Amino acid sequence: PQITLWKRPLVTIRIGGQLKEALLNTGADDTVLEEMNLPGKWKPKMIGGVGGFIKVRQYDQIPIEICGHKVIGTVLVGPTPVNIIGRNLLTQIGCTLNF
Amino acid sequence: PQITLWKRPLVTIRIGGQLKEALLNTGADDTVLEEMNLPGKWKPKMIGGVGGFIKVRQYDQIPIEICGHKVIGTVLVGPTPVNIIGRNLLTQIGCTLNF
């Protein structure tokens, strides 16, 4: 699609067989999902936002579906208020900013 | 232009003949720039996302030249770690997310 930006660019994603709403976020280096359980080994990481930091669980090589695109990548899980699809996965679905 | 997302989508902006780098951020409702003087009246606003909030000042009718496009709109000023062009101005320059 060509998604306009008058509203938040929210899409449907699927991970671990759970469907979630997530924000297409060119301002995020990484993909950060709200607190949830995921099987697998993980590493702790700290990420930064506009006014603070949150600790996340980094899972690697996770299959995740974004707006119908089956991709594989790193997902961070932690106390974000909104599920965020960041550049690590936006690049896999071929997403560009056009103006 | 069409901007891929392998790197952070940083572009040059001009505001009152001042040269500034800023991040094209589809995950931000609003535009927020690091501390600077801007003309006109303002009101305090809280903004946040990942982690805690920061207090900023809201100025209106501020022209910004973004990657060649002169636009005019609301600009928040405050202790953001990164200059951020949010949807309020992205829409004004005709920006979409395409895949």
């Binding site: 924000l23 976020n25 301002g27 995020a28 280096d29 990484d30 950060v32 990481k45 700290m46 990420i47 930064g48 936002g49 506009v50 974000t80 208020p81 909104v82 965020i84 960041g86 | 991040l23 951020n25 995950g27 931000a28 409702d29 609003d30 927020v32 903004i47 946040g48 996302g49 990942v50 909030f53 953001t80 770690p81 990164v82 951020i84 949010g86």
Partner: peptide
């Protein structure tokens, strides 16, 4: 109300 989701790797 959270509205700016800048996120950066460290």
């Amino acid at each position: 109300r959270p509205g700016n989701f800048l996120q950066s790797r460290l």
